[PDB]
Paper text:
TcdA and TcdB bacterial toxins are primary determinants of disease pathogenesis and are attractive therapeutic targets. TcdA and TcdB contain domains that use UDP-glucose to glucosylate and inactivate host Rho GTPases, resulting in cytoskeletal changes causing cell rounding and loss of intestinal integrity. The GTD domains of TcdA and TcdB catalyze transfer of a glucosyl residue to a nucleophilic threonine acceptor in Rho GTPases.
The binding of UDP and isofagomine is well resolved in the binding pocket. The α and β phosphates of UDP also interact with structural waters and coordinate to the Mn2+ metal cation, which is in turn coordinated to the carboxyl groups of Asp288 and Glu515. The cationic nitrogen of isofagomine is 2.6 Å from O of the β-phosphate of UDP in an ion-pair interaction. A structural water molecule is 2.7 Å on the opposite face of the isofagomine cation in appropriate position to act as the attacking nucleophile for the hydrolytic reaction of TcdB with UDP-glucose. O3 of isofagomine is hydrogen bonded with the carboxylate of Asp286 and the Arg273 guanidinium. Movement of the loop from residues Gln510 to Asp523 (10 Å) towards the binding pocket occurs on inhibitor binding and is highlighted with the black arrow. The entropic contribution for isofagomine and noeuromycin binding was –TΔS = 0.5 ± 0.2 kcal/mol and -TΔS = 4.2 ± 0.3 kcal/mol, respectively. Larger enthalpic contributions of isofagomine binding to TcdB-GTD in the presence of UDP is consistent with the Ki values presented in Table 2, making isofagomine the more potent inhibitor.
Numbering used by the authors: 2 to 546
Write the structure that this text describes.
Amino acid sequence: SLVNRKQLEKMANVRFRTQEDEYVAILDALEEYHNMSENTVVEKYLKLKDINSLTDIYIDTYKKSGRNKALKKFKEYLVTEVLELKNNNLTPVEKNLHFVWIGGQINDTAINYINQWKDVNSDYNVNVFYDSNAFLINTLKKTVVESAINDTLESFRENLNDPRFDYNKFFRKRMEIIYDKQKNFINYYKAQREENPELIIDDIVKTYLSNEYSKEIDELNTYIEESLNKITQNSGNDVRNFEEFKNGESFNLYEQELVERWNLAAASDILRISALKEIGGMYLDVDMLPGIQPDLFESIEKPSSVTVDFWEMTKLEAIMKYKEYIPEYTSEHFDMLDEEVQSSFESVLASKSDKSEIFSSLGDMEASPLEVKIAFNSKGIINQGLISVKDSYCSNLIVKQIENRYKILNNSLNPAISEDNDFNTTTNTFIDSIMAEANADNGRFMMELGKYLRVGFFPDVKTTINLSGPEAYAAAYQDLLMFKEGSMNIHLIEADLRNFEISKTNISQSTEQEMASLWSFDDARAKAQFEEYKRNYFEGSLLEH
Ligand SMILES: O=c1ccn([C@@H]2O[C@H](COP(=O)(O)OP(=O)(O)O)[C@@H](O)[C@H]2O)c(=O)[nH]1
Ligand SMILES: OC[C@H]1CNC[C@@H](O)[C@@H]1O
Ligand SMILES: [Mn+2]
């Protein structure tokens, strides 16, 4: 229990000192809190917030006060009490599974993963969010990148056999051309905006494609129709019918990522938290699988020399080898084990006739009205799994974190874009604005933003995580525990974040599709892509008329 008024009066006592008005305000607010049995969890949190605010006013007003040490201890007690309020007052989570697949047709691989969740959660309504207006974004991005690859290989043909023209130099020159093609597209998009705003994204994208890359609108229309038909058959839920999201102050950010940046991961980041806030339930990336029954492989000991990641992937690969639930699932880890260990997996699985004996169900989940729970890995929290009741306090804090992060980004980036200059010029203008605008609080967040323009086009560019992804979640949890909004300087450690984490039992994260990121790539994949592009040029395109 949080200290009562008598107990704080004892802690912050200063003999023969008159009670300041600001001090009595804290004592009155504390006493009111202890008499809020009839009130909601959010009302109780907002009272604690008020008490923390009144305590900060006292400390800021009377800088040298003898009460200040005890009041700073009381501030620690308020944080502890928020955690007790969070952990002790749970309400049911709406039985909704939310997935997002935007920007193009959904692959059978995504559907096969989604179907594993449906099969062991018969009691759950499933939404696969898609955007009926933007099925051609993945096609636009692929077209433009392929064009920029060809133009780079052509322009630097003479240098391609030179090892000093490495993968890094290739991606730098390609980015110059990609930025000009993206600038050409957005200067086109916003010119066309102010002709017929009753044209959907796919309509304007078809004219860019079947103008300047000579694509067949017959086949593009077929692609849209097959995409709409397929998603409609697989629990499709259209973003364009989600009115609170369309009307809200994050929709412009969604459309920025979807249409200007072609970052479907960032767009999914913005949409998923609005789906949780507005509907409640559990969000999952399409590369996530249900938790494995915790004791399924209890009888098989992990080899000492092998990583946790190797062992978790081998368990899913064993399931898919012998039960074949997901066709064409890799066995690349499982195949590294000798016949003895392989046979132990086979004999464990040979005695199970139903998927419910392999994969666990979510069942009846509960969470705090205050919180959003987040998945985690050895590197920290990750928003590939989220649980929230409808209109949770944290869902609102996360939306506002994302909005504030985009406010700061766009304030420095958008001037540069609008000055019709090339990639490197735009980059330096942007970076100069960042270093000029940086302050003590937000400084560290700034400087994580410098590579924003490169997201999806360069190896090891992860800016999305700092804007719409995990950092926004950590900052929202800091907002909740520090009774404020707009935390930019994150000091939470894993002990703090552990209170907001989804149990490992509720998600299998170590899947085949999880190892293949759709919006980022590492140096090894970059080197291999560069070798692939030179091969397809020298042995393919160069030899053609
Ligand atoms: O063309 C795409 C690519 C990505 N995504 C969304 O972005 C999420 C994150 O993708 P990914 O798992 O590649 O990100 P990572 O786990 O590598 O950070 C996916 O689950 C989708 O909801 C999408 O909707 N369409
Ligand atoms: O924030 C970008 C991405 C980070 N990795 C997990 C994904 O769900 C997310 O979109
Ligand atoms: Mn993933």
